[PDB]
Design a protein around this ligand. Sequence first.
Ligand code: B12
Ligand SMILES: O=S([O-])[O-]
Ligand SMILES: [Cl-]
Ligand SMILES: [Cl-]
Ligand SMILES: [Cl-]
Length: 405
Amino acid sequence: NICEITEVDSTLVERLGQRLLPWMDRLSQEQLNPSIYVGLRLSSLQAGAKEAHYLHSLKLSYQQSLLRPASNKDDNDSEAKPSMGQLALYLLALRANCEFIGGRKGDRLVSQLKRFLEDEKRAIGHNHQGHPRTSYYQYSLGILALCVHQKRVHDSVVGKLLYAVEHSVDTMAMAGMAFSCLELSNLNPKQRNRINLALKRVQEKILKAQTPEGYFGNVYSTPLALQLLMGSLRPSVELGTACLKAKAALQASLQHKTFQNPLMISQLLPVLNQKSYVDLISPDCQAPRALLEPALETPPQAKVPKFIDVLLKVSGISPSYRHSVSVPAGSSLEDILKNAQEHGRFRFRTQASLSGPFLTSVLGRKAGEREFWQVLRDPDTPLQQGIADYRPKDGETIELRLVGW
Ligand code: B12
Ligand SMILES: O=S([O-])[O-]
Ligand SMILES: [Cl-]
Ligand SMILES: [Cl-]
Ligand SMILES: [Cl-]
């Protein structure tokens, strides 16, 4: 296939995998990450049989938390649990171990995911003058996750996604993979034609989105886009060119340590192994993988490091707030934040996600329903990495801006 990453330096891939290895020891309820486990299982890499403990840890945790009694005694809360989109990835984790969801606990969970989608269908509503409470990315994730387990969704639910696509790149790709999955499964034959037409649309909007550099959307949407695109069934001359450009562009960033984020790597590894979430319909759990071994190194400089002087600014609320910090080069935005909070009038709050610390609140202002804290490098360039991964350059002005999407 033309859209498949054929050539990859084994030592590049080994490095990426090594970035995921430490997370296999990180088994707390907030650190457990179904997306990492899927990423590895579909990769050419193995992270010890630490993997088995991981999946087991997931299993126990996603069950204990989501299947809690009729009304829990005296709180209405005690412990944040997995989101429904996360549950969809848990379902993917299961397939990656060649398991179908089952038994009573597994039925209850499929139900939960089904109720999720229904509630989103209703939030959208009627004739689409409404937004999912989460997003169409999670909507598609949900349909996809049930599809790989041979579980059918109501035609009405699937319609909502189909309409959305018929009338970004990451959501295109996920919607695409859901569609691809439903076609290959023939789970909704009563709209078999409409789904096909939707994939052509999806493909189109992705290539349309390609940047001069070769990226579909940006470097980070690229892995997910390639996952959907290696599924072909429309192989063309424009599609071949696009994929060739996209692939070279992606390999180019791999020599620049561009991928640092565990979730991002977990979306990248399958691509480097000619695999996609759609391969979870029937996974090959017999296929060998190279064992990753602990690095155990990290070169001790004993140097005096460069410092960056960086300026932090908060906008989109009254009052705005600036802050001046000098920190070691390679410090992350998150380090700079923690520092500002520690040595200054700054404060902020993050909450866990599978991508890591999501910035939810700044200076006592929590983002609401359709608001979020955007992070940008001034002037008006939105960052492509989160607070923990983005390592500011010298002189930069970093803006935390409360926006209404
Ligand atoms: C939907 C979405 C959003 C929504 C999330 C709110 C919502 N509507 O639910 C919005 C639009 C707010 C958003 C914001 C941002 N996003 Co976003 N987002 C996505 C998308 C499409 C899906 C995420 C999702 O639903 N995951 C599924 C569920 C199961 O995962 P989850 O962990 O439970 O989901 C939560 C987190 O993903 C969190 N979140 C969303 N984006 C990001 C980014 C980072 C770095 C972190 C730590 C968390 C985070 O929002 C979800 C909770 O609702 C992904 C695409 C992808 N390829 O993964 C990008 C993606 C994760 N986002 C990304 C980026 C860059 C950002 C921002 C930093 C943008 C910016 N310049 O400010 C911010 C985060 C800022 C902050 N406050 O911390 C990148 C990450 C790249 C990387 N190297 O890690 C992705 C991959 C998109 C891309 N291709 O560039 N995002
Ligand atoms: O989808 S995220 O990049 O805002
Ligand atoms: Cl239930
Ligand atoms: Cl990254
Ligand atoms: Cl805060």
